[PDB]
Amino acid sequence: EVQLVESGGGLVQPGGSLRLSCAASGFNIKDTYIHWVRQAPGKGLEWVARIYPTNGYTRYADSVKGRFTISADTSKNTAYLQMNSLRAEDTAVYYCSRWGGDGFYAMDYWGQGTLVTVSSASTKGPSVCPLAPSGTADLGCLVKDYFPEPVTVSWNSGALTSGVHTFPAVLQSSGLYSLSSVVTVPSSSLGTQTYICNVNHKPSNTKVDKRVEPK
Amino acid sequence: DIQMTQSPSSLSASVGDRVTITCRASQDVNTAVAWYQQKPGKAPKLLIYSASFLYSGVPSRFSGSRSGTDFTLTISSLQPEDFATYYCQQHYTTPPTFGQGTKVEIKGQPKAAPSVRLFPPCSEELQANKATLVCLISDFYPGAVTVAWKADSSPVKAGVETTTPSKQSNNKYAASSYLSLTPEQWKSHRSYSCQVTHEGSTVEKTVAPTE
């Protein structure tokens, strides 16, 4: 069974460095070229580099030259991408790939991909504030200006489940995330029932609570 | 550097449609062209190599052909597992290049109109000299939505940040739009408005500093 397995990837800062790996099995690298291909979120595929592990001959795309280095290792059956001088626009899912063999220059096998995020934003827990409600009403919590993903939002410590809708985060031009969570509740519960949103941002080791009250 | 121009960028099809996708190469590439399929969060899978050779295990309702620098993928009768994104690629020269992709989408069941929920600023932000209007858009299908913001009744383009629609677990869509303001700005107007238009229906919601 031909397989390609990638490892490494993650958040890094511009200027910084990361190393990806592509462990082959089910065939011998040496018999073919190994490639790296990458996919910026919401975009197409862009070839990045290539190596013939029999001799180490490399090729690169212009946008990466002098920045990235593809390499291989016979013994361990493994290709690497060393990525330096990283920029925001190297953010992508990075796939490794091979040609078939002989004159078969389509990519028949791909690894599962690994995500690399390049951002200058610094780790930061969110500023949370309650979204006051004006049958039913709508109330919520605005989770503002955190980095990186993710956050988890519960209501009344996980006890309040009906009417709960937590929305996907927007990534703002600033490079920070914001999101909202709303609950639909009985209008007759307002001013009486306690509603608390509990916000947990593990990357900054931060939990925040906020009580939501009518006005 | 050889460019692959793929058309169309998107298509909604019915199961059983004959679907054709086209790639124009910017210069001659012979027959050194592959097609790939990709599903969300997965790796591309090879469909067709050397322009017209069907890869092993790919159903035969798939085929590819060439006229000049025009390359074409045909699916004779669309099946559900075919809904996906398709990419062509030339492998004639280095570097190999891809089309921008064609998204083949389900022509969805009856539409659903969005709930729009528009909130004014928090105190906590006002006291820190910030302000955010929050427009939450849920339970709509298909997942294409036009968001317009207005102050009094004048269009506002500045400081809009809107998410791309994402599928809820109920298979309808949600999205969020945030208008960033200063308190000054907020108080300067009588009302602000979040306008959502979806499949020919407009849902407007407004909020006012004076309560």
Side-chain angles (χ1 to χ4, degrees), chain B residues 6 18 21 39 54 76 87 91-92 105 111 113 131 142 162 173 181 184 207-208:
Chain B
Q6 209 170 330
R18 196 181 166 78
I21 308 178
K39 301 196 189 167
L54 191 75
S76 54
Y87 290 101
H91 55 260
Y92 188 63
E105 278 169 311
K111 68 156 177 172
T162 290
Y173 283 83
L181 294 185
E184 302 72 1
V207 289

Side-chain angles (χ1 to χ4, degrees), chain B residues 75-89:
Chain B
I75 311 179
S76 54
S77 180
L78 203 48
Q79 304 300 123
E81 67 256 41
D82 301 347
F83 291 105
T85 301
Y86 293 90
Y87 290 101
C88 63
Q89 170 208 68

Side-chain angles (χ1 to χ4, degrees), chain B residues 89-152:
Chain B
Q89 170 208 68
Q90 68 83 15
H91 55 260
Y92 188 63
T93 191
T94 283
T97 53
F98 300 82
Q100 42 99 128
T102 295
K103 201 175 179 293
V104 184
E105 278 169 311
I106 293 152
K107 206 173 322 195
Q109 37 86 208
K111 68 156 177 172
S115 313
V116 183
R117 300 180 268 175
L118 169 62
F119 288 102
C122 312
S123 330
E124 289 77 343
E125 282 206 320
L126 286 171
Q127 297 164 12
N129 199 51
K130 297 165 297 183
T132 319
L133 312 193
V134 183
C135 179
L136 305 176
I137 319 179
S138 36
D139 299 324
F140 57 97
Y141 188 90
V145 77
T146 307
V147 174
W149 286 97
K150 291 179 186 173
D152 288 301

Side-chain angles (χ1 to χ4, degrees), chain A residues 35 37 39 43-47 50 59 61 95 99 104-112 127-133 138-140 142 144 163 165 167-174 178-180 182-184 210 215, chain B residues 34 36 38 41-46 48-50 55 87 89 91 94-100 117 119-125 130-132 134 136-139 161-164 166 168 173-176 178 180 211:
Chain A
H35 303 263
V37 187
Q39 175 163 57
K43 310 277 189 208
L45 298 160
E46 186 199 10
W47 178 81
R50 152 195 137 171
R59 300 295 303 281
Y95 296 103
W99 284 344
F104 310 121
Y105 305 140
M107 292 166 191
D108 60 332
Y109 282 96
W110 300 64
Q112 78 285 3
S127 300
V128 180
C129 56
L131 297 181
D138 271 70
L139 55 77
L142 173 70
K144 201 77 179 305
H165 190 169
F167 282 71
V170 64
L171 170 56
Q172 308 167 101
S173 67
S174 75
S178 304
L179 66 73
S180 298
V182 290
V183 202
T184 297
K210 289 296 177 162
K215 213 55 163 287
Chain B
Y36 294 102
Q38 183 176 39
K42 309 295 174 165
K45 151 199 172 217
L46 172 67
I48 292 171
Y49 61 94
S50 290
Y55 182 61
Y87 290 101
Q89 170 208 68
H91 55 260
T94 283
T97 53
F98 300 82
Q100 42 99 128
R117 300 180 268 175
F119 288 102
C122 312
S123 330
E124 289 77 343
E125 282 206 320
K130 297 165 297 183
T132 319
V134 183
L136 305 176
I137 319 179
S138 36
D139 299 324
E161 307 256 25
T162 290
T163 69
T164 58
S166 57
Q168 293 164 176
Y173 283 83
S176 314
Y178 297 85
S180 298
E211 299 146 283

Side-chain angles (χ1 to χ4, degrees), chain A residues 50-110:
Chain A
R50 152 195 137 171
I51 183 162
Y52 189 21
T54 287
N55 53 19
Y57 284 6
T58 65
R59 300 295 303 281
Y60 300 82
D62 277 355
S63 67
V64 138
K65 263 170 180 172
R67 259 156 28 66
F68 297 4
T69 297
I70 190 182
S71 58
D73 190 290
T74 326
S75 55
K76 298 211 294 310
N77 197 232
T78 298
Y80 302 101
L81 189 71
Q82 181 62 57
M83 297 182 298
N84 309 305
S85 288
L86 277 167
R87 314 169 188 188
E89 46 280 322
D90 302 318
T91 301
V93 180
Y94 287 66
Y95 296 103
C96 69
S97 198
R98 67 171 217 182
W99 284 344
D102 196 296
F104 310 121
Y105 305 140
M107 292 166 191
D108 60 332
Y109 282 96
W110 300 64

